[PDB]
């Protein structure tokens, strides 16, 4: 269960092929990484957590299957992560954006320290048309 349709074309986008507890990794810092699963928890993270830092297993967002379609982009937003070290009261959240790739792994493109939001991009043919 990982899909969404284009509101004006009826086209159905299905990312179920990327789902699974095994998940993937995104390069974080020098040699560190972030473990993440699509539309579900990751086996390398705490129960119910969809993305986490590899060194600590600390959560950067609880998994969910709420895939949204926004201006040709497919997006997932994992919220309710662990406490933000850069701002009191906030929790980590992860934004995963799928963009069409005419023709491998997600990329952490930005870490907003003021809102503790990790922005990832994933160019895949699964998001085309």
């Amino acid at each position: 269960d990982c899909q969404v349709t284009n509101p004006s074309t009826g086209h159905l986008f299905d990312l179920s092929s990327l789902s699974g507890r095994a998940g993937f990794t995104a390069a974080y810092s020098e040699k560190g990484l972030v473990y993440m699963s699509i539309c579900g928890e990751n086996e390398n993270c705490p129960p119910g957590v969809g993305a986490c830092f590899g060194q600590t297993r600390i959560s950067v967002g609880k998994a969910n299957k709420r895939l949204r379609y926004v201006d040709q982009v497919l997006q997932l937003v994992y919220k309710d992560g662990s406490p933000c070290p850069s701002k009191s009261g906030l929790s980590y959240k992860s934004v995963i954006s799928f963009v069409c790739r005419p023709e491998n792994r997600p990329m952490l493109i930005s870490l907003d320290k003021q809102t503790c939001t990790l922005f990832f991009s994933w160019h895949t043919p699964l998001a085309c048309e």
Side-chain angles (χ1 to χ4, degrees):
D1 307 297
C2 201
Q3 57 193 58
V4 70
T5 58
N6 185 325
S8 59
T9 66
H11 179 284
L12 184 291
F13 292 98
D14 171 50
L15 298 182
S16 73
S17 73
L18 301 177
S19 65
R21 297 184 70 259
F24 312 73
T25 66
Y28 172 62
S29 185
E30 190 73 61
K31 299 182 178 179
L33 60 84
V34 168
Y35 284 116
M36 58 191 282
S37 277
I38 301 307
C39 281
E41 58 173 42
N42 180 278
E43 60 183 38
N44 305 91
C45 302
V49 172
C52 66
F53 290 115
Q55 189 73 40
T56 65
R57 302 252 171 307
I58 289 173
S59 176
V60 288
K62 289 182 188 170
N64 66 58
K65 307 176 179 183
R66 300 178 71 184
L67 188 64
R68 300 187 175 73
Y69 179 93
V70 57
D71 287 306
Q72 299 175 291
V73 178
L74 310 184
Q75 184 169 275
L76 287 173
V77 180
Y78 295 170
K79 66 174 180 176
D80 300 319
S82 62
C84 186
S86 50
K87 180 161 278 62
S88 310
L90 301 185
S91 296
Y92 276 109
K93 68 168 64 177
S94 291
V95 180
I96 305 170
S97 305
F98 300 87
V99 176
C100 164
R101 187 79 192 195
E103 194 172 7
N104 300 175
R105 38 130 55 149
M107 293 186 68
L108 172 54
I109 58 176
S110 183
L111 190 336
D112 186 309
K113 304 193 66 176
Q114 303 301 159
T115 181
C116 252
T117 305
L118 285 73
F119 289 94
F120 298 81
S121 62
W122 194 334
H123 293 267
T124 169
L126 289 174
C128 302
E129 282 185 297

